């Protein structure tokens, strides 16, 4: 879960 | 009291509750309301999108964490804190935590555990205003959050 939150979160960061 | 806590809790609680219930809390926020209203607009726009785009992953996390009561929220707390243990902190991660919180809040309502939304919102708020408080303040708090995710009108 924490790895998934990091991955999703870093992807949101890149998108914006 | 701690205004950063108060504002963060209000925004996060309002988002989680309106997601869980499908209904906006109709009573306007009277304190730091302009920024808090923009933060809620931002969460509906970006947060709803995170949940849609990553629905399968979010469902997998929901399954793994098995959050069904307040004691289980302590487990989410440890997970969220350790997200940041790789030394990386950014707005993407922060909004993703709140987004996943909404996803959990919806599920809690379906199993008649709406009562656990308060501890859930407190746990997410705590990561922001205690664990990562210094970063959050340096980044201009909720005004910074709103700025980062704002849409330029062309």
Give the span between the Cα atoms of B108 and B105, in whole angstroms.
5
Domains of chain B: 1-149 (1.10.437.10)
B143 token code pair:
């005004």
Say whether B95 and A5 touch across the interface (CB within 8 A).
no
Are the beta carbons of B73 and B119 closer than 8 angstroms? yes
**Resolution of the experimentally solved model in angstroms:** 1.5
B62 token code pair:
């929901």
Q: Which residue of B has its CA nearest to A1?
A: B61
Give the span between the Cα atoms of B147 and B150, in whole angstroms.
5
- What is the least distance, in Å, from the CA of B65 to any CA of chain A? 8
Q: Closest by alpha carbon to A11, among B46, B143, B11, B7?
A: B46
Task: Name the burial class of residue B114, with classes exposed (0-12), middle (13-18) and buried (19+) by CB atoms within 10 angstroms of its CB.
Answer: middle
Give the span between the Cα atoms of B46 and B95, in whole angstroms.
8
Nearest to B90 among A2, A4, A9 (CB): A9
B window 115-134, beta carbon within 8 A of A: none
Residues of B in contact with A15 (CB under 8 A): 92
Say whether B96 and A5 touch across the interface (CB within 8 A).
yes
Give the span between the Cα atoms of B133 and B127, in whole angstroms.
8
Residues of B in contact with A9 (CB under 8 A): 83, 90, 92-97
B24: helix, strand or coil: coil
Q: Tokens 């309106």 label which residue?
A: B18
């Amino acid at each position: 879960a924490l790895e998934t939150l990091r991955r999703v979160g870093d992807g949101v960061q890149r998108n914006h | 009291g701690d205004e950063l806590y108060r504002q963060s809790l209000e925004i996060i609680s309002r988002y989680l509750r309106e997601q869980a219930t499908g209904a906006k809390d109709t009573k306007p926020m009277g304190r730091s309301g302009a920024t808090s209203r923009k933060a809620l607009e931002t969460l509906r726009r970006v947060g709803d999108g995170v949940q849609r785009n990553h629905e399968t992953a979010f469902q997998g996390m929901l399954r793994k964490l098995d959050i069904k009561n307040e004691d289980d929220v302590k487990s989410l707390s440890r997970v969220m804190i350790h997200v940041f243990s790789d030394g990386v902190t950014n707005w993407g991660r922060i909004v993703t935590l709140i987004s996943f919180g909404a996803f959990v809040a919806k599920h809690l309502k379906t199993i008649n555990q709406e009562s656990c939304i308060e501890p859930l919102a407190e746990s997410i708020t705590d990561v922001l205003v205690r664990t990562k408080r210094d970063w959050l303040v340096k980044q201009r708090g909720w005004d910074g959050f709103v700025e980062f995710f704002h849409v330029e009108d062309l």
